[PDB]
Write an enzyme that holds these catalytic residues in place. Structure first.
Site, short mmCIF file in Angstrom:
data_model
loop_
_atom_site.label_atom_id
_atom_site.label_comp_id
_atom_site.label_asym_id
_atom_site.label_seq_id
_atom_site.Cartn_x
_atom_site.Cartn_y
_atom_site.Cartn_z
N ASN A 1 0.84 -1.22 0.00
CA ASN A 1 0.00 0.00 0.00
C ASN A 1 0.87 1.26 0.00
O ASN A 1 2.03 1.21 0.39
CB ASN A 1 -0.92 0.03 1.22
CG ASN A 1 -1.79 -1.22 1.33
OD1 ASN A 1 -1.88 -1.83 2.41
ND2 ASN A 1 -2.43 -1.60 0.23
N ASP B 1 -0.97 -5.66 2.15
CA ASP B 1 -2.15 -6.52 2.24
C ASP B 1 -1.74 -7.97 1.97
O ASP B 1 -0.97 -8.24 1.04
CB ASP B 1 -3.19 -6.13 1.19
CG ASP B 1 -3.93 -4.84 1.51
OD1 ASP B 1 -3.72 -4.23 2.59
OD2 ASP B 1 -4.78 -4.46 0.66
#
Ligand SMILES: [Ag+]
Ligand code: NA
Ligand code: NA
Ligand code: NA
Ligand code: NA
Ligand code: NA
Length: 129
Positions: free
Chosen positions: A46, A52
């Site tokens: 990110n 993630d």
């Protein structure tokens, strides 16, 4: 592991996601499709420096410790690498905490933009469940 659609639906169902906080199984399958393409090994960085992880793209900013997201939380009390297993237990248990935190499935960007308000039942069409 890259799950088949119906294979993942079955795994999610046995783990208690069907209608969990009112979100039908198709919502969860749709979210996994557009978050990870059903790939347990998926990782994505990110812009804030968090990452993630796994089948439901759980972010290290809040939910797991990956050893490289300073000033973040570990609300699922797990190393992020746990979310990458061929078995989805850790991802499911953490997802249950996420979806229960106030924002529902809106926590998943792909769900809000690609699944929310669509015919999500289509994601479990033909599956023996
Ligand atoms: Ag499992
Ligand atoms: Na990856
Ligand atoms: Na990171
Ligand atoms: Na995950
Ligand atoms: Na973290
Ligand atoms: Na779409």
């Amino acid at each position: 592991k890259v799950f088949g659609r119906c294979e993942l639906a079955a795994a999610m169902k046995r783990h208690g996601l069907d209608n969990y906080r009112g979100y039908s199984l198709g919502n969860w399958v749709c979210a996994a499709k557009f978050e990870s393409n059903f790939n347990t090994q998926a990782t994505n960085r990110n812009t804030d420096g968090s990452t993630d992880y796994g089948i439901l793209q759980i972010n290290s900013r809040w939910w797991c410790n990956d050893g490289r997201t300073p000033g973040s939380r570990n609300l699922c009390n797990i190393p992020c690498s746990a979310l990458l297993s061929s078995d989805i237990t850790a991802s499911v248990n953490c997802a249950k905490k996420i979806v229960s935190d106030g924002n529902g499935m809106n926590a998943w960007v792909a769900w809000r933009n690609r699944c929310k308000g669509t015919d999500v039942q289509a994601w479990i069409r033909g599956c023996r469940l």
